[PDB]
């Protein structure tokens, strides 16, 4: 409030939680060694009109041959950042290898199809992993001629993503199955002319498309990590197949399905994990947290304070009081007493006083305070009278009570130079 | 200092953005408070017409007793209301007989209950112990003696 | 079927010089009235509403000022002003009393109007039917940071206050309010209310059980007209639905991506490294802030509308309940002889004891 | 209001969530209350 003399009241302030104590890290026990040193170390990788496709599953990815590397001419991760790739377990992902010039690499992009990526192979702007490229003028460039390998540059219409057709049509604008080169009848295929002598844009570069099947099967490849135990009913961390997080775990009560993993209660939350080694539990990421407001009588009786926690049931209160994960941590700090009711929760500095007064401090739901002390509430001046036959209250003397009433007339006439 | 060019102006437009939005935020809540306060001010003038400029016959709107007078006082952005009320204080315990069969017919005084049968002495106020020489003007003809309660006589 | 409108109720009269419609009998019509007293006391841990956390998220939270702080002040005002309305309506009671529970006076089985010692609920079963008329769509703890904090006043003690008012209205004489009580015997009370309507008191005695049977049959018909019946009660529920709408809207925009790659924490933290990342995060921050600002703004807008309603609510507790409010059909739609209180979740109901003279004639003067 | 008839900008508008709809809810509540109050102030004596 920015003061030194302060008066009395339920005064709200900044927020708390429980700092998460441990972590539960869950993998399956899968291990295999990827053909990274095959998919990125061989030479049999076909052309662009025959764009290759390899399947990846049940492996372990290193993500280390990639960054600690000088082999690569043109690398960028597109859907992702490379840095936190090591913390990603995927499933069943895909790569496509082919031999090109040094100029399609720019048209190798989401969108941006141009000619060859408008006639041979195609993406959305969406489902993106990474893209790797390097020169192999030292395996794939015979200045005698790479007459061996081709692409296609003729088609009716534009491409669709992730599609392959080999059919060297005797191509013609309106059908005409021909014997090319009868006139207006050609073929889409075309060689490469890759020479050992040529420059940047024209030497054969081996380029790999890195499409990442993410979170669409229970994760078969993992990154180099180590799994942990379980921790029931404690504010801790999560780290799953791709799901880290913060909160509390506890088993299910539900009707789960064999393909299934996530629950996303109202939105995008996953709500639950089928553990990657056969358990099926809930999620409660809200450990306990929220707001606090303090009660103090206001510097003219005392300076003794009392603390209102507002999202608890007095379970973890004295816990994180002694487990020491309370973000308004205190050196002025005790453990004295707690009143438990007003399901916002636990109020420290307080005793359930059975006799009740005029409700100074409006605690939550019905409960109120005094001195300090606290009761529920005296509801008002309880009398007990009723109807009468004839005897009746009549006045003979009286009173006049002039009272206040306090009303504004108008707030301040202000204004703003918006231009200054 | 370290700028010249549109990246500059990008940062500038971010400043414009945030200051614009917070500025509008200010203004919006200002108009909110203006609405709250103007409705309350409508009530205020309403009472100033009512409580101050007359004896407001509606009860407990001006004050919290019975509104004998009301005395207004200005204030910085505000106004103060001296509600000269009336609260009665000396409680009694006295008895009655509502309908009176005096000569064989029912009697109700003045619309204005409790015929004071503290030994059938007078007929009183709503709100006081008051001596009243009872008359026929302090009753009316009400048919005959059929649903009467009190049997009081000597009705002067 | 599609038409224009039967525009009202067609009749046509002109004057008559002396022959005049003069009622030789009468009627009483008690009416519903739905006044929403206090919408849902809700708050936001904005600090976790936005930004469950990364941690970088909390840095950018620092980088957009104290918006969370100001909206926390806003929410505090929101709640406290609901409470102010709640109070300012409710404990206008100087002296609380005790429910005599003898429960047949004048002519009146007052059943379910006051509650019962015989029932485990201290809530009156009329209002409990209203509770049954509520629709919707340990502790509550979402991952959303969004709370319905409990109202200060106990709903049972709401009910206690209402029943106390019912008692002290039905008892205590006309001075009930600015004073304590008067012990007036309730035929003499409602006899005195014929004088603020300004008429004789004979007809009360002439229609002792008649007005009584009018009355108790009318209450019965109120039970009839409210038990299974139509939507003419849920203005309350409209407001409730709007709260749900806004909250659901808040969550479903929390689902929204805004041109970034994902739309939720740690999912972003996968594919991100560097401030471009946090630029996208700032977009999330921006839109969430906006929607939030909009939310709380309109919460305050609703709050102004509801404070107007609350002013009406306390007003009809004042003039209409405690006295016979001479402003004609402000309270009900007759003459307003009495009106008695009833409660509601978020609201208050009233029992508008009107008065209608009724037997149309033609007699000269 | 935002792009009058659009192709991309509709998809961008969805990427701003569902805001248009919510504002229309506000619009509806406006018009609803307008003619509500029209009824309220004027349709008083239903006996024509």
Residue numbers in the entry:
A (entry chain B): 290 to 660, 674 to 722
B (entry chain B): 964 to 1119
C (entry chain A): 675 to 811, 832 to 1059
D (entry chain C): 723 to 770
What do the authors of the reporting publication say about this deposited model?
After 3D classification and refinement, three conformational states of the S-ACE2 complex were captured and determined at resolutions of 5.4 Å, 4.2 Å and 4.5 Å. The “up” CTD1 and the bound ACE2 are flexible, as shown by a 3D classification analysis that yielded three major ACE2-bound conformational states, in which the “up” CTD1s had different “up” angles (the angle between the long axes of the “up” CTD1 and the horizontal plane) of 51.2°, 73.3° and 111.6°. However, the “up” angles of the CTD1s from the ACE2-bound conformations were in the range of 50° to 111.6°. Upon binding to the receptor ACE2, CTD2 tended to exhibit a hinge motion away from the S2 stem. The “down” to “up” conformational switch of one CTD1 and its binding to one ACE2 did not induce significant conformational changes in the stem region of the prefusion S glycoprotein. The S2’ cleavage site located in a surface pocket of the stem around Arg797 and covered by a “C”-shaped loop (residues 787–796) is inaccessible in both the unbound-down and the ACE2-bound SARS-CoV S glycoprotein structures. However, we did not observe more than one ACE2 or more than one “up” CTD1 in one spike.
The spike (S) glycoprotein of the coronavirus is a class I viral fusion protein located on the outer envelope of the virion that plays a critical role in viral infection by recognizing host cell receptors and mediating fusion of the viral and cellular membranes. The coronavirus S glycoprotein is synthesized as a precursor protein consisting of ~1,300 amino acids that is then cleaved into an amino (N)-terminal S1 subunit (~700 amino acids) and a carboxyl (C)-terminal S2 subunit (~600 amino acids). Among these, CTD1 is the receptor-binding domain, and one CTD1 in the trimer adopts an “up” conformation as a prerequisite for the binding of SARS-CoV to the cellular receptor angiotensin-converting enzyme 2 (ACE2).
